[PDB]
């Protein structure tokens, strides 16, 4: 077996390599890439996402969120404050205030100590969830925005057509900005290009051990739990990576830097934080190997975690007895 101790691995594709994306998935997977649940992927040297970033400042961030933490520093949720409507300039001299900027700091290592120490002490404002791409029309290789579509994916191995979209999402990140303990919808693949600015730490836990993770969640978050038997989809907790060591919980981290992909793969939970000012383009993705993930996939029916369109498809497809109770919970 590839990679049994579930390390992160980091690929290197040639130009040639960077052609055929659904090809070099699977040929990391035929290297045990899936194994961590997530992969590293720095781009050939000929590669490039685009010509500048210096003609973003105009985009609009509709609804910046104050993301607001509970608990104790290792243990915390956090709730997403609505804010007015800023843009991409405004947002980043924002991010680059005294209340915002990133602290001193001698390494990763150290602000990776900053960050857990005294996340729960702010209110970063993070600009995620915004429909688009910052991806070239003329960029061929890699492109979030021109991947075969998850639709199309199921009709290919299922023959069975459905409805629905697959679109990328801009990230607009600050110094905490964080995202929580969370698989894709749908146990899905992402993948996440950190197109310019400070780096983004992630956190994963292999999907092999994914339901240990699940099972300390329900010990640290024990009201969350009897409100829904799969809160983590409601993508508000954090644990820190002590806590995880104190608990047995296998994870490993590594830090993106821009210019870097990262893939995460089914039932790979997932979390992390922003350096400092940043844009990441994100979309899901699916391959052969996904459907069986998709069919086991655990649902929020509370009404929480409330998801886009084309999930219904999905679940009626792959989870027609769990549909009727799903779709109570998105109305
Ligand atoms: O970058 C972020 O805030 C969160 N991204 C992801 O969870 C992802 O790409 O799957
Ligand atoms: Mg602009
Ligand atoms: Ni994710
Ligand atoms: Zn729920």
Redesign the pocket.
């Known amino acids: 077996a590839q990679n049994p101790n579930c390390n992160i691995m980091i690929f290197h594709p040639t130009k040639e390599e960077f052609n055929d994306f659904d090809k070099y998935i699977a040929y990391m997977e035929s290297q045990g890439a899936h194994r961590a649940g997530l992969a590293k992927i720095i781009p050939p040297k000929e590669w490039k996402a685009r010509e500048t970033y210096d003609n973003i400042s105009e985009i609009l961030i509709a609804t910046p969120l104050q993301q607001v933490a509970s608990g104790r520093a290792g243990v915390f949720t956090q709730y997403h404050k609505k804010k007015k409507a800023m843009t991409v300039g405004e947002y980043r001299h924002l991010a680059n205030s005294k209340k915002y900027q990133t602290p001193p700091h001698q390494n990763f290592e150290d602000l990776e100590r900053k960050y857990w120490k005294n996340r729960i002490y702010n209110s970063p404002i ?1 600009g ?1 969830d915004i429909s688009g791409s910052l991806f070239d029309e003329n960029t061929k290789q890699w492109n979030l925005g021109h991947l075969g579509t998850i639709q199309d994916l199921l009709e290919k191995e299922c023959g069975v057509v459905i409805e629905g979209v697959n679109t990328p999402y801009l ?1 607009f ?1 600050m110094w905490k ?1 964080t ?1 929580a303990w ?1 698989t ?1 919808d749908m146990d899905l693949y ?3 290009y950190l197109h310019l600015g400070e780096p ?1 730490t992630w956190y994963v836990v292999p999907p092999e051990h994914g339901q240990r993770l699940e099972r300390l969640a329900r010990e640290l978050f024990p009201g969350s739990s009897r409100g829904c038997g799969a809160f983590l989809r409601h993508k508000v907790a954090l644990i820190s990576p002590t806590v995880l060591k104190e608990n047995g919980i296998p994870f490993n981290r590594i830090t993106q830097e821009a210019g870097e992909f ?1 893939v ?1 793969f089914p039932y790979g939970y ?1 979390a ?1 934080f922003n350096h400092g000012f940043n844009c ?1 383009e ?1 979309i899901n993705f699916a391959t052969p190997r996904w459907i069986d993930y998709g069919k086991m996939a655990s649902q929020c029916s509370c009404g929480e975690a409330r998801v886009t369109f084309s999930m219904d498809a999905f679940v009626r497809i792959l989870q027609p007895e769990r549909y009727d109770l799903w779709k109570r919970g998105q109305d």
């Open positions: 993070y995620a990230y990140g900005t995202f969370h894709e992402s993948i996440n983004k990262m995460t997932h992390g990441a994100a």
